[PDB]
Amino acid sequence: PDKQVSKLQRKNKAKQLRAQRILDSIENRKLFEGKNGAAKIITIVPLVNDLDPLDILYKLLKCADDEGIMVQEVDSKRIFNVHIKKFKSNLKIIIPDMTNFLNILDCAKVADFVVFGLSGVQEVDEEFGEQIIRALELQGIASYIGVISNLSAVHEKEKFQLDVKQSLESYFKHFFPSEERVYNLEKNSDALNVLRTLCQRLPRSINWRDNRGYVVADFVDFVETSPDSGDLVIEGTVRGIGFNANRLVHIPDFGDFQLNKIEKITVFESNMNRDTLDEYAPEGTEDWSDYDEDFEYDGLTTARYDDHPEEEERQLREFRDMEKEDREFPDEIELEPSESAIERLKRYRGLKNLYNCDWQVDEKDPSSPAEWKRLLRIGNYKNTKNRIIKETKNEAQAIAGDRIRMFIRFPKFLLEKIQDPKQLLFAVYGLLLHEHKNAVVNFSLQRWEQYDKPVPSQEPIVVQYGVRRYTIQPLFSQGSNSPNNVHKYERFLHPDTVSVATCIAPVDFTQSPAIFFKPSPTDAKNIELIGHGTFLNADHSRILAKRAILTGHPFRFHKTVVTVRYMFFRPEDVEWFKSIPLFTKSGRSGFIKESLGTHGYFKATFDGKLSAQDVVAMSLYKRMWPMPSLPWN
Amino acid sequence: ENDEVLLAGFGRKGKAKGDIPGVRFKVVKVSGVSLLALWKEKKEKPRS
Amino acid sequence: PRAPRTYSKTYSTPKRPYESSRLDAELKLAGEFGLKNKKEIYRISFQLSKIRRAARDLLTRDEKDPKRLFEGNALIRRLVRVGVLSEDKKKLDYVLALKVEDFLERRLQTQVYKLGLAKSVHHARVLITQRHIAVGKQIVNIPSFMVRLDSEKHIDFAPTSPFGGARPGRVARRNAARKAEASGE
RNA sequence: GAAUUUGGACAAACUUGGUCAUUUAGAGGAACUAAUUUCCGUAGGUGAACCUGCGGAAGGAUCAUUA
RNA sequence: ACCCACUCGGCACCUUACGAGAAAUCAAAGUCUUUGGGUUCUGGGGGGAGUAUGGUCGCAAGGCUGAAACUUAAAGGAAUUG
RNA sequence: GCGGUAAUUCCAGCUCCAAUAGCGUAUAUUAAAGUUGUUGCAGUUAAAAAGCUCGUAGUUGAACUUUGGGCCCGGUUGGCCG
RNA sequence: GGAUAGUGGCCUACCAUGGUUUCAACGGGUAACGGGGAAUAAGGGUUCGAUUCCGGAGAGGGAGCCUGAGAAACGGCUACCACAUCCAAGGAAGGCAGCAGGCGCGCAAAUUACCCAAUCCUAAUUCAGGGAGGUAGUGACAAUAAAUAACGAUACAGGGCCC
RNA sequence: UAUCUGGUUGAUCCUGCCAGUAGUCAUAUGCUUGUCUCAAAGAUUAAGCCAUGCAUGUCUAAGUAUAAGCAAUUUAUACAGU
């Protein structure tokens, strides 16, 4: 009842809201502060072939005023557990190799800062360096700092030495314009601000990266407990949301694994509730989920309506030709008049409108994958992933910033690809509950900036969504919002407007960004990048419909309406395709009626007015089915 | 989702641009990268 | 902290922005007097607005009053020495009847054309901002100069800066040396 | 002439009660949204547009007869 | 008691339109852009709402006072016309 | 408000305009606003005259009290007078 | 009477019952330091003024005090509260709302630069000193002026029209 | 430097607000950005916390120097210049 609640000076007592925020601001910064329980991760990437980025760390650690210049000798380590006295911070500085492009992309897929080298002398590489900036920039950067490091920033130019700073600031903004200036490392306090910013500025979170616990391995070793498999020993700092023993875990270029125990530096093993290295397989649980929909050959009338090296380059010229013509007359199959148009079009189903009609979700298909019932069905994906992240909070045994020796069930088959954790970056990413097992997913492709070559619809494309990377032959569709969730299949991909791919792959629960590429092993750096995109959701009900358009000409007008030239060939073509209506190019609708077919001609009926030297087109629709996918290592 | 947008109102002191039932603020800048310039393809947008 | 430097803007923007008379009538001024912006007209509207204000207040005062006689005669005399106002109209009732073509009559850009040897009124402006023309001992490179009617008998080409003498310049150097001398090898 | 020491004003501050307002995790609850004649005042009544009693207003459509 | 004339005060009609007004109409709603005789109260788009809350008076019914967040491009007055 | 389809408003290409080293948007504020009213509003019917009267503070409050005539002195303006 | 540098309920003792108010006390609020000013330009106003000058107040929060002519002084001290630093653990030490920097916060704000040469200030003092102040850096806060083209010939269409 | 124009209707005249317009030494932001003169700049939220460096010292013929400091000793182991 009492509702004055006015005229108060204790408003100042709403400084307690300023103490809760400062309290959380300190409770953010327990993890990164101290000689104990702390590490930053920094990566130095030269965007030129030049520079040999050792010297970036040389210039950048002159301003420590310590004995951290004793490490960084000519002795090559590439990961440095450097503490700085002057800022009470401890850094894990990484330099990846310039050859392995995937080392670069999988480095900043762990990092917290990405210090970019630039050059005064040699321009930024268009085909390699720019691709580094774009690709890091689309997989997600925690934080990022620009650096000019040439002596010839002065030594070339006593010609008012700065002006290259406008070119590199100005160049450097065009990717990420949250950066005002590009720091010089050839003067003192400029380098100091770089060092400060590394030490004490917070890096932001990356949502998929921090909703999965992950370590950076400081020591790897293998323990035999089995004659082929065994146990690993991995020492590192937990930085993500954390770990539980009952999850799996993931390593890039090795795949998914199942860890055994976790040491804390209380030890937990993995009990009953741990998940396995399969899909939702079980080989008898399919036929408990029984289905109905049969499009048999019952009815020799009545299509389904429910009435109301140089040879591959010649293949490339074939793909450019088929996309070139498939632009101009899209979905228009060209019947051979010699061959009967019945056998070709047996499985097709004609529709008034895709958007309005309703399919029962599957059918007695048999061009589906038989593992269709071996797929995890999802309700509301939002009401899946917030629940799973909710269980990940409440059941994380490993708080971040804790040192862990990690015990992973691991084969002796795979020790021969392991390197030491100094010259490279064996780093281990956690997973979530159902992030191992297969369901029908959806991405959202868009083309790369330089890229203009055509992409067909089921050629294989490597997809890096989050950390894992699969080899995927996709299914493309334009983005639209039909209520039945039934969308038109694409045979090639658009010039610019963002489409949707679809395939079968195991699920992400974080909607990670994705880069799409094909491997280019003969070419330059090991990848010709195709596109970038974002994991939309896991929808099994995303029904793509293959559209095939049969096209005819009229001969003689004014009588009923119109006849047929090129549409059909036989009077067998009547009975299948003449309950199915028909469209034209700002015209009429429906119901061709029979005549001769002995030469070619089918005397059509319509609804409307205008007819001239024009075309006449009908349609038939068929579901496309997803293809299963494999990892890429 | 979970990005950093800068808001400003439409220009009516709140209510509408038009038919819109109860939406009053427009987004000016995502991730500090200025939707005008992205829409005109002058900068790029890094993720987070 | 030291005294604030005082400053004040000159032009005055028009109140109705798209007004079919004004948009067209200004542009005739832009044509004949060769001005780069409509702002260069607005500045003249503002100077005229201050003379019309200062004149308009003095007419509320009486004759034989020292403020009107003094400030009045200073106003008028200051406008006579710039040649905006003519000579017979020293009354102060007339200084309200001025208009923009009287100030724009006296820009140096047009004084060089009306004066002679600048053939156009655009060629005149280029002669100004390219350091050629002068007023006296002094060079002027700024068009909006308001030649003060005593200096009309002094406007000429500069002592330096050819058209005025002693040198040919840059382009005649490259021609007469690096083509005509280039015929010698 | 140091430590120390009695009383005094000046007094920060503490501990208990009661009391008020406010953030704060917060087990739960309660709900919450999206897949015709016109009146006024007043009293009573019916699932409901409503009906009835008393007083008031037109914000409502006066032709004839008076020699 | 009439009848006639005149006058003071009252209730009204009726007629002009001199002025007023958006108009219907008005001896005042006139003498207010040629914008000041004296004074009291009220309103400042429409809903939210005469509601919520607080006082306050009432045995009670209720009266007095009376917001805001919010939502909206109209809501309303006079008059003519098939 | 334009576009259920021969788009003056959507998408581009030309062309044009306006401002010009500046231009555009949000928010506030002033003008516009005689929608704050002293100058200067409105209250029959559009929002608004309080149910009437008394009555204190407040605001405002009839007229009237040496007027005129002589008389020089006495500075300015204007002039044939120059 | 005490106290004060000094009048004074400033404070003590005794005595009296007063003092302010709808000409709005008192209480509440202020995203309120006050002015000189600023913005808007018919007049009349309305809105703003943390911000270069004057005046006040504060130096994390309150309190107390030393020394001095002048401090309730914080680039002085003492205690308590709240924070927080080094520690060998016994103790020791501190307040950028000076300057430059950070960190948070935010829609929102630059250099850990050069110098006492001006301006003036301080001392026993022309000399020493001064992030008072100045100079440069950053700076599309705001202002002022104003480049991105001027002129010929030839030729086609003119509008004139030279006599 | 004394100005309004679109929106309520079949069409009208109105009350009326909404929107448009211009200024802002009022801040923010977006896109651009060649010259000169000038110049604000952690006020708004958080009088929130601060690493380091620096911001307060001071001398003349003229208070006191046995520096076991320096210089020429040079007028003088009374001192006596700095």
DSSP string, A405-434: EEEEE--GGGGGG---TTTS--EEEE--SS
Beta bridge partners of B29: B6
Taking residue C170's Cβ as centre, other Cβ atoms within 10 Å add up to 8
* Distance from C-alpha of C22 to C-alpha of C36, rounded to nearest angstrom: 17
Domain contains C181:
yes
Do β-strands A144-148 and A113-118 pair in parallel, antiparallel, or remain unpaired?
A: parallel
Residue A588 near residue A561, CB atoms below 8 Å = yes
A87 nearest nt, CA–C1': H51
Q: Which token pair is C184? A: 């010698």
Q: What DSSP state is assigned to residue B32? A: T
- Whether the beta carbon of B9 falls within 7 A of nucleic chain H: the reply is no
Do β-strands A486-488 and A89-94 pair in parallel, antiparallel, or remain unpaired?
A: unpaired
In DSSP notation, A199-243 reads: HHSPPPP-HHHHSS-EEEEEEEEEE-SSSS--EEEEEEE--SS--
What resolution in angstroms does the PDB record give?
3.6
List the single residue in A with minimal CA-CA distance to B32.
A178
Domain contains C115:
yes
* Distance from C-alpha of A248 to C-alpha of A406, rounded to nearest angstrom: 12
* Distance from C-alpha of B26 to C-alpha of B7, rounded to nearest angstrom: 6
* Distance from C-alpha of A533 to C-alpha of A514, rounded to nearest angstrom: 5
Q: What is the dihedral of CA A572, A573, A575, A581, to 10 degrees?
A: -170
Domain contains C1:
no
**What residues make up the domain containing C178?**
17-185
Whose structure tokens read 């269709």?
Answer: A372
Taking residue A269's Cβ as centre, other Cβ atoms within 10 Å add up to 11
CA angle A522, A53, A81 (to 5 degrees): 110
List the single residue in A with minimal CA-CA distance to B43.
A174
Residue C83 near residue C151, CB atoms below 8 Å = no
* Distance from C-alpha of C4 to C-alpha of B33, rounded to nearest angstrom: 37
Domain contains C9:
no
Burial A214-242 (b: 16+ CB within 10 A, else e): bbbbbebebeeeeeeebbbbbbbbbbbbb
Whose structure tokens read 């290592």?
Answer: A633
G110 C1' – A190 CA distance, angstroms?
Answer: 14
Domain contains C10:
no
Q: Calculate the CA B11 to chain-centre distance.
A: 13
Q: Which of residues 4-43 of B touch A (CB under 8 A)?
A: 31-34, 37, 42-43
Domain contains C11:
no
Positive or negative, the Cα torsion across C71, C75, C80, C81?
A: positive
Do β-strands A144-148 and A183-184 pair in parallel, antiparallel, or remain unpaired?
A: parallel
Cα atoms in the Cβ-side hemisphere of radius 13 Å centred on C82: 16
For an interface test with B, which of A131, A132, A170, A175 has the most B Cβ atoms less than 10 Å from its Cβ?
A: A175
Q: Which token pair is A468? A: 């894992």
Domain contains C134:
yes
Percent helix, strand and coil across chain A, each to the nearest 5: 20, 25, 55
Domain contains C7:
no
* Distance from C-alpha of A622 to C-alpha of C107, rounded to nearest angstrom: 80
Secondary element (H or E) of residue C39: helix C39-58
* Distance from C-alpha of A447 to C-alpha of A494, rounded to nearest angstrom: 9
Of B1, B43, B48, Cβ closest to residue A177? B43
Instruction: Flag whether B touches A (3+ CB pairs, 8 A cutoff).
Output: yes
Cα atoms in the Cβ-side hemisphere of radius 13 Å centred on A16: 4
* CB within 8 Å of A582: residues ≥ 6 apart: A588, A589, A590, A591, A592, A604, A606, A616, A617, A618
Q: Calculate the CA A202 to chain-centre distance.
A: 26
Number of structural domains found in chain C:
1
In angstroms, the first-to-last Cα distance of chain B is 10
Closest Cα in chain A, distance from residue B10 (Å): 25
Phi, psi of A614 (to 5 degrees): -140, -175
